């Protein structure tokens, strides 16, 4: 299918994914065009921070869905 990721600047990129893909696979695809390592990425969907290990099927991410990308600011 095809999903959207709202990036750090607000610009929204398009990704080609499958419902069986893990989000570490998706974080890998965000790295391809944004250069963010997956361990530094936080992907949020429906108010939920997406846990590396699950697939897009467990979160029910369907076509034309918009994920939001934010970094981790420790304190």
């Amino acid at each position: 299918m095809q999903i959207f990721v709202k990036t750090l600047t607000g610009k929204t990129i398009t990704l080609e994914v499958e419902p069986s893909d893990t989000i570490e696979n998706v974080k890998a695809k965000i790295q391809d065009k944004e250069g963010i390592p997956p361990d530094q990425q936080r992907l949020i969907f429906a108010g939920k921070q997406l846990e590396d290990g699950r697939t897009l099927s467990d979160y029910n991410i369907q076509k034309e869905s918009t994920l939001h990308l934010v970094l981790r600011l420790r304190g």
């Binding site: 095809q2 959207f4 709202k6 750090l8 600047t9 607000g10 610009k11 929204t12 990129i13 398009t14 944004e34 250069g35 963010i36 530094q40 936080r42 949020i44 969907f45 429906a46 108010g47 939920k48 921070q49 034309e64 869905s65 918009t66 939001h68 934010v70 970094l71 981790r72 600011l73 420790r74 304190g75």
Partner: protein, 304 residues
């Protein structure tokens, strides 16, 4: 003196203590927790969370009172969020752990006549192909906070929360998306709006960007925000119902990307218009001028 209890820092735990001071300063959130946990009088995250917030939402009962909130971290460490008990963490990531745990706890609860927690809102996403001008249908997704990108800053050019919000709501060009009319790809126009506003509005100002070189950059720029916030301009529908919000608390991050310290400005509890600077175990009176001059990271607004 109208001072709240402080919270001990038992190992870089200011990310939790700052969030708890902010959350306890949101009276609608605490009233919802009391309503939600009232069914258990007919373990759980909500009971542990309410015990701390109820105590932090009132003036201290003893002079220089200090509480310990790591019982909360223990239960999250056991069941929701696998982290150490000593490493620095992001207060916004914790906010989403708490908010996800409460939605999961409510989905398993038996009193479904009760409302979702007040931070829960819904955003709209409209999309239209630029080639054929065929508007795709509306997509609503929920949100528990707004993560706003901080635009580029110029000397002498103010940087306002209203600007950050409008940029989050502005339309954009999205290239290489398949169309259902052109069958195709093509370039789409996408825009996010706000469908359902939450009674408690958490605003996350992204103080981490990505540099052109390939490393994170702390955003030190001051973002101007007001005690009063009108959200009418960002609604999807032409709703004639007004949406006025009032500032309850600010979570502030000092330091760089790796190292840092979280602090919180919050209103004093009525047993009003008096403000507090809370840094873990230390609570001081602060003027509204100091609050509005802080470098906000999380902003907690409550609808009036």
């Amino acid at each position: 003196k109208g001072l709240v209890p402080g919270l001990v820092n038992l190992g870089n735990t200011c990310f939790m203590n700052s969030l708890l001071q902010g959350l306890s300063a949101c009276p609608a959130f605490i009233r919802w927790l009391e309503e939600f946990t009232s069914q258990y009088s007919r373990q759980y995250l909500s009971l542990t969370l309410l015990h701390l917030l109820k105590a932090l939402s009132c003036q201290e009962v003893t002079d220089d009172e200090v509480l310990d909130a790591s019982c909360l971290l223990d239960v999250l460490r056991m069941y929701r969020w696998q982290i150490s008990s000593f490493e620095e963490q992001d207060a916004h990531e914790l906010f989403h752990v708490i908010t996800s745990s409460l939605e999961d706890e409510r989905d398993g609860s038996g009193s479904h006549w009760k409302s979702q927690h007040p931070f829960h809102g819904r955003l709209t996403s409209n999309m239209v192909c630029k080639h054929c001008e065929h508007q795709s249908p509306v997509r609503f997704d929920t949100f528990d906070s707004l993560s706003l990108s901080i635009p580029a800053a110029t000397w002498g050019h103010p940087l306002t929360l209203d600007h950050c919000l409008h940029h989050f709501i502005s339309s954009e060009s999205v290239r290489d998306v398949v169309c259902d009319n052109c069958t195709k790809r093509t370039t789409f126009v996408k825009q996010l709006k706000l469908g359902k506003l939450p009674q408690c509005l958490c605003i996350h100002l992204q103080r981490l960007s990505w540099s052109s070189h390939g490393t994170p950059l702390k955003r030190h720029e001051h973002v101007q925000f007001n005690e009063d916030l009108s959200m009418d301009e960002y609604k999807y529908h032409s709703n004639a119902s007004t949406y006025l919000f009032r500032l309850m608390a600010v979570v502030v991050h000092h330091g760089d990307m790796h190292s840092g310290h979280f602090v919180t400005y919050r209103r004093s509890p009525p047993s009003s218009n008096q403000w507090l600077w809370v840094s873990d175990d230390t609570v001081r009176k602060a003027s509204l001028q100091e609050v509005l001059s802080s470098s906000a990271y999380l902003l907690f607004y409550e609808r009036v």
